[PDB]
Structure formats: C-alpha cells, structure tokens
C-alpha cells in the first residue's frame, strides 16, 4: 500500500459575517473529504459515497451529538483566547488531528491548534507535552498538562484508534483510494520548455527538468499539483532555454513507482 493519512479539522470564527457558520469540522482521507459538520446544519454528514454506504445511521447520529458538544467547547476555548489576547473583532481558531500509515508499515500521529491561522499549540505525544508559541498558549499549556490522563488518552488515540479508523476507511474507499491512473505527459515551447502532465491519480507526482543528465533545481519553475475536477490531477514544470549553447534537456516524471523520461530534440 502507498502512504495514507486520516485527518480532521475544526474551524471556529468568533464574529462571523451574517449567514457564515461559526463552526465547521471536516474529515479527510488523503486529499478526499469524507465527513462534514457545521453549526448551521448541526448534522454530521458524509462527503464521500463510500462513507455513506459503509457507516450505518447510528454512526452519523452518535457523532452528530459529539460534534454539537465539540462545537460548544470550541466556542468556549476561542472566547478564552480572544479575552487573553485582548483582541476585538473576528478571530479564528483551528484544530487539526490525524495520523499517517506509511508504506513501510510505520505510523505518525499529530495534533495541533492555530489562532488566526498561525501555530498556537502543538502536541508531542512522545514527551506527552504541549509546545506553546507565546504566553497565551503557555497559560493554556499549563492547564492542559495538569490533566495528565487527557494526554495519555490522546497518545492512545493517535497511535491506536486513529490508525484503526484509517485502515477501516481505506477498505471502504479502496476502489477510489488504492487505484492508479498514470499521467499523460507532453512537452511544448513557450522562451522556455514546459513539461505538462495530466489525468493522473494519486496526486503525488515528481516532475523535474535535467540538463545533460544533471538536475538544476534552482533554475526550474515547479507548478502546483492541481485538481482537474474529475478525480484526477495535473501539474507542470518549466525551464528556460539557453540560446548560447546546445544542451540535451529532458523532462523526468515519477508517479506511483514508474519513471518516465521525455528527451527534447
């Protein structure tokens, strides 16, 4: 199996514009949304059809209740931060929790928080401690670390439960998540050479330009991997052409264990 990950986000907004939810929580497996909840619907709902088809109504009903409580707790926490920062206006609070099951069988687990889109508190599940970025986070860190059983619970959740959920969802969604669609790759002139790939899944891809068999990482322009809208992705990389010497330029693409080379005449 390739590396896979499971992660859940929460967002809280302290003074949202009319209509906009004060709380949103979304789960992902790899790049795929699987679950969504917000303070307007007050319901946890599937975002992938293979989640809807494999989790019975008691699952959605139970986590709907839990998310209603998590929503209130997020509001209380953000209220405490904005009071301690002495901030007026609308501010945001975010959480990300999750785990990865690597190709080689090893695992990672992570939990962190942000205020106004910047790291605020980061959990270390091996030393069982919270890393604080400023003195507001430091005040929170002290209260959270005084609840030692909560830290032990989170370590167990990251290392055992989360990986178990991930394996369960990976099987539910295996027709989507474990498939391979190889890239279609082409080169054109625009002066620079553009190497373009499209139609591939999973989105992880490595594209580079080499000059006479040497990579020139500093001179290459790397495009972002972008969703095409149909479940596949596209990407590109470019390199500028030297008119003063002939060189063999070649595009190199690595995707899902296959390497491809396109030599430019």
């Amino acid at each position: 199996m390739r590396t896979h990950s499971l992660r859940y986000f929460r967002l809280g907004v302290s003074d949202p514009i009319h209509g906009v939810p004060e709380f949103i929580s979304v789960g992902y497996v790899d790049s795929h949304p699987i679950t969504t909840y917000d303070s307007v619907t007050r319901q946890k709902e599937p975002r992938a059809p293979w989640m809807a088809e494999n989790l019975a109504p008691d699952h959605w009903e139970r986590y709907t209740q839990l998310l209603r409580g998590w929503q209130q707790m997020f509001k209380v926490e953000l209220k405490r931060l904005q009071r301690h920062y002495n901030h007026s206006g609308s501010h945001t609070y975010q959480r990300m929790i999750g785990c990865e099951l690597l190709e080689d069988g090893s695992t990672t687990g992570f939990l962190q928080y942000a205020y106004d889109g910047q790291d605020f508190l980061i959990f270390n599940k091996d030393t069982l401690s919270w890393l604080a970025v400023d003195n507001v986070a430091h005040t929170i860190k002290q209260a959270w670390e005084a609840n030692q059983h909560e830290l032990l619970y989170q370590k167990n959740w990251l290392e055992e439960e989360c990986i178990a959920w991930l394996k369960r969802f990976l099987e539910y969604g295996k027709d989507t998540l474990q498939r391979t669609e190889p890239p279609l790759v082409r080169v054109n002139r625009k002066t620079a050479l553009f190497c373009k790939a499209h139609g591939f899944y999973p989105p992880e891809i490595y594209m580079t330009w080499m000059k006479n068999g040497e990579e020139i990482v500093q001179e290459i322009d790397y495009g972002d991997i972008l969703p095409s809208g149909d479940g596949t992705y596209q990407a590109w990389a470019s390199i500028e052409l030297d008119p003063q010497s002939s060189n063999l330029y070649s595009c190199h693409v690595e995707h899902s264990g296959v390497h491809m080379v396109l030599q430019v005449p």
Partner: antibody
Amino acid sequence: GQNIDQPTEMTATEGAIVQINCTYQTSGFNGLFWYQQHAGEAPTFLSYNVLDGLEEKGRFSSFLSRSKGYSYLLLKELQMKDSASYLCAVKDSNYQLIWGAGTKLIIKP
Amino acid sequence: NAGVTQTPKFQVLKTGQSMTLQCAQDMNHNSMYWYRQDPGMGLRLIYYSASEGTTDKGEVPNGYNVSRLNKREFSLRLESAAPSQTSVYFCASSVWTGEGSGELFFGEGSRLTVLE
C-alpha cells in the same frame, strides 16, 4: 457484541490484599474506568487507565494490559470501609461506556 | 457546591402513572446522563445530553423521555409507568463528552417501584 466481565463477588480478610479483575472485548478502546459504589450510595470515580501499566493512588492501584484486554483493581491493607461494589467500565471507539456488572467485595474482620 | 442533586429518593407508582425525576448539577458541566441500575447487570444508559441544547437516546430509551431544560438541569419523564421500570435511577454528569479521560459524577439515586 461488546462485553465486560468481572466476578460477581469476592471475600477477603481485613488487612490483606485483593485483586479485582475486569476483562473486556470492545469495538475500539479509549480507556478503562474503575468506580466504587457503597451499598445504597452513588458510584464514585476511583481510577482511569488507557496506556499499559500500573498506576497507584493511595492503597489502591489500577493495572491495564491493552493487548490482553484486562485490568485489575488492587486493594492493599484492606479495611472494613472497603466493603463495597467495584464497577469497571470501558469507553469504546465512539466514547460509549460499556459497564461491567460490578464485583461485590466482602471483608472479614 | 452540591455536585449532582436528584429527586426524589424514593417513589411508589401504580402501573400507568406518570412521574418526573429531577436532576441538577452545579459544577458547570456540559454533559448529563440518566442511567438505570438493576441487579445482575451493568448500568444502562437511558438518555443523555452531550451539551446544552441537545439530547439523544441511550441503550434503553423506550418508556422514557428527557428534557435538557438548561445547562444545569436534565429531567427524566416516565409518561406511563410499567412494572419493568422498577429500578434505581442515577443521574450523572461530566465536564464534556467525546474525550476519553473525563469521569462521571453521580447523583444519589432514585428508587422507583411500579406496582399493578
């Protein structure tokens, strides 16, 4: 389904030690609780374990083995006021508590 | 600083009679629970309220209803009492739910006997 098992009753002598066992088979695991309940009274919290090993709290210690699905509550230097039921309970993958039926501890003076 | 206060301690009911059990907590807890305890079996959850403003069924909801009236109070209603509802009822609360380590704080229990 999900099950928690503990002996119905145990009898030990004042001053001695007793180990109360709890085994569990659950869908996921988010921690194991022990509660004390004196006859006619409300249960009260004794301990929580979620990683492997022994934790001590005065005369009571609580042990957990996640791979064996087993915990014990260990009471040392038994006194008459330890006569009570001891309830084990486990949080499953969705944080629901599955409760054992309780062990009644009888102490001989 | 009373913890969890539930009433009444004892009650006898005829089959078909209605009854409300009251529970309040002064600990600023968010989650509340109604359990029944019967001989030879573990506590069984009747209904719960994970936060103010929401409630849901537990494992044995039939014959019961609940009201989370405010953050402090969670009442349990037996609309038409039956002999099988003879039991000891416990209200409980915890700071939050959907976290592993948080423990329950129990009220003193209400003993109900329903007779034909």
